[PDB]
Amino acid sequence: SQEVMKNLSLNFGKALDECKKEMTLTDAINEDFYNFWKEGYEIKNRETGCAIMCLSTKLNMLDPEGNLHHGNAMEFAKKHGADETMAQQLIDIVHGCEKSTPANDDKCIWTLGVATCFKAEIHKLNWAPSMD
Length: 132
Ligand SMILES: COc1nccnc1CC(C)C
Ligand SMILES: COc1nccnc1CC(C)C
Known about the structure:
Helix content is 63%, strand content 0%. It is mostly helical. It has a single domain (1-132), classed as Recoverin, domain 1 (Orthogonal Bundle). Helix 5 packs across helix 6 (84-100). It is globular and about 35 Å long. One 2-isobutyl-3-methoxypyrazine (PRZ) binds next to helix 1. The PDB classes it as attractant. Keywords: alpha-helical, liganded, attractant. The assembly is monomeric.
């Protein structure tokens, strides 16, 4: 549900400010986060992939190679209002996109691709939120 996905994204984003400092990241990234769930919007900045990976890691959802920890990702979904069935769905999508996205040494870019694949799957389900 959109409503859930809205709360997830707001909460995934909360620690952005800490990552900064910790990464040297710019304001191109805030424009990418602000626009993320916009239909057809396309993330072009490498450094936004870096920021997602830093956020996910800080939430214990990511191993040091960029892959999803499925258990921890379920725990994060459930903490923010996803029931079981929605959470496991979110998980099957990230995992599916992990498998489909070309492998890449550049974790930041690979993370872009996964996050793009994910966003597209979520619009398809009619779950992408309107983030004011
Ligand atoms: C795990 O990452 C997430 N999980 C659920 C919802 N939103 C995101 C992130 C965004 C949009 C930055
Ligand atoms: C956990 O969220 C994530 N984990 C790894 C890479 N990308 C994201 C964003 C998604 C899944 C949209």
